[PDB]
């Protein structure tokens, strides 16, 4: 099996940037290599084959070149549309395979987050379960810190985070994070917090609120 | 105009066989090119599992070919997977692609693909929880609401909202593994205007339990 590599798996730019993709063969491959466009919901476009060649319909700022082992994608003036992972495929002999893939981020303005607490439902602790939740909404960038503080102290243990991809249309994050425990810790302890740290701020931003109201 | 999408069962058991089957539209099977099953793996590992040839001829992956059986009926213009003995490694998204038979071997069209799971793990209906401010929480602008919707397997899940504006933005965040069983959650905000007078609830439908829950939120 030809093994390919994309020593790059994270790539981060500005739009109307010039961006490369690099792809890597175990072995001479002569020129069959193909590009794929795979974007979050999972829909996959054939971008460029034989190198260099543009699949009918793909944007002439789309281009690849290369020989041997070594082969390269050039996106360049990067566009809003083009937030995706590139994989780069051998087609010389069977099996044919696959890279790793490059995520490919635009950059942004950076972004505070916009932070909510919501505390367990009336349902949910009839059921016997207590859950709080934290939105931490359209943020950049993508790098942020959430702790739990239950009446003031430190939670690690039953935190369940969740990232969305970047936002197609205003280059964008968010995330959530949820808290659970039973309905008896739960009652035990008035205050729950939610600290969210990011680069946009030096100190936190803290949302909580308190049983006892 | 050419169009393939795929559809089988998403959940089956350790050990039993994958069926699969692509539906090709906008172009025979018979006339030309390769039609071909794929499938990418956690982690973004994308591996070719086969194809059959409009003539045809059938090729596997060697790594696969002691479980692996493509057929076709030209008749639906259908082509199928199966894949036997299936272990939880086996847990992937589907994909099936129409290729070059031969010459540059570049997939020209391909599915949407479908995620397909091995587990013995029982299917659930999930439990629905609004997520509304509480009380004390006096607010500005525009307000956040949400789902919880908790305990369910398989994956998948949709989520949709109604309010009455079409300023709405939301977001859905991907599901997560909760000792078994999935947990998921979706956001919305609106104009603090908007709530509570117009009326804002979540639908959560689930497939595999078929099953909709419809929660209003309330202050």
């Known amino acids: 099996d030809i093994q390919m590599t994309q020593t790059t798996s994270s790539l981060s730019a500005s739009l109307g940037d010039r961006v490369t993709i690099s792809c890597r063969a175990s072995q001479d491959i002569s020129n069959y290599l193909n590009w794929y466009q795979q974007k979050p919901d999972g829909t996959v476009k054939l971008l460029i084959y034989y190198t260099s060649r543009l699949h009918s319909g793909v944007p002439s700022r789309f281009s690849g070149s290369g020989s041997g082992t070594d082969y390269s994608l050039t996106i360049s003036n990067l566009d809003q549309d083009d937030i995706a992972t590139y994989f780069c495929?051998?087609?010389?002999?069977?099996?044919?395979?696959f890279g790793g893939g490059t995520k490919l981020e635009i950059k942004r303005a950076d972004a505070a987050p916009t932070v909510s607490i919501f505390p367990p439902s009336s349902e949910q602790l009839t059921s016997g379960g207590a859950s709080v939740v934290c939105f931490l909404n359209n943020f950049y960038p993508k790098d942020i810190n959430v702790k739990w503080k239950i009446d003031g102290s430190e939670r690690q243990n039953g935190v369940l985070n969740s990232w969305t991809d970047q936002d197609s249309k205003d280059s964008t994050y968010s995330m959530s994070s949820t808290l659970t425990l039973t309905k008896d810790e739960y009652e035990r302890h008035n205050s729950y917090t939610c600290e969210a740290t990011h680069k946009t701020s030096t100190s936190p931003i803290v949302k909580s609120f308190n049983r006892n109201e | 105009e050419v169009q393939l999408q795929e559809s089988g069962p998403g959940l089956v058991k350790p050990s039993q066989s994958l069926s699969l089957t692509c539906t090709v539209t906008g172009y025979s099977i018979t006339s030309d090119y390769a039609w071909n099953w794929l499938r990418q793996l956690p982690g973004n590992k994308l591996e070719w599992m086969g194809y059959?040839?409009?003539?045809?001829?059938?090729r596997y992956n060697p790594s696969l070919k002691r479980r692996i059986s493509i057929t076709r009926d030209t008749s639906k213009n259908q082509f199928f997977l199966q894949l036997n003995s299936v272990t939880t490694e086996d847990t992937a998204t589907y994909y099936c692609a129409r290729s070059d038979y031969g010459n540059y071997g570049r997939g020209d069209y391909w599915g949407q693909g479908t995620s397909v799971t091995v587990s013995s793990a029982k299917t659930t209906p999930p439990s629905v929880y609004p997520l509304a401010p509480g009380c004390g929480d006096t607010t500005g602008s525009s307000v956040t609401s949400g789902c919880l919707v908790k305990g369910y397997f398989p994956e998948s899940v949709t989520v949709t909202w109604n309010s009455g504006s079409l300023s709405s933005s939301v977001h859905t965040f991907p599901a997560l593994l909760q000792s078994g069983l999935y947990t998921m959650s979706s956001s919305v905000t609106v104009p603090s205007s908007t709530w509570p007078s117009e009326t804002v609830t979540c639908s959560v439908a689930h497939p595999a339990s078929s099953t909709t829950v419809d929660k209003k939120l309330e202050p």
């Open positions: 495929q051998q087609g010389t002999t069977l099996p044919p395979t």
């Open positions: 059959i040839s409009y003539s045809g001829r059938i």
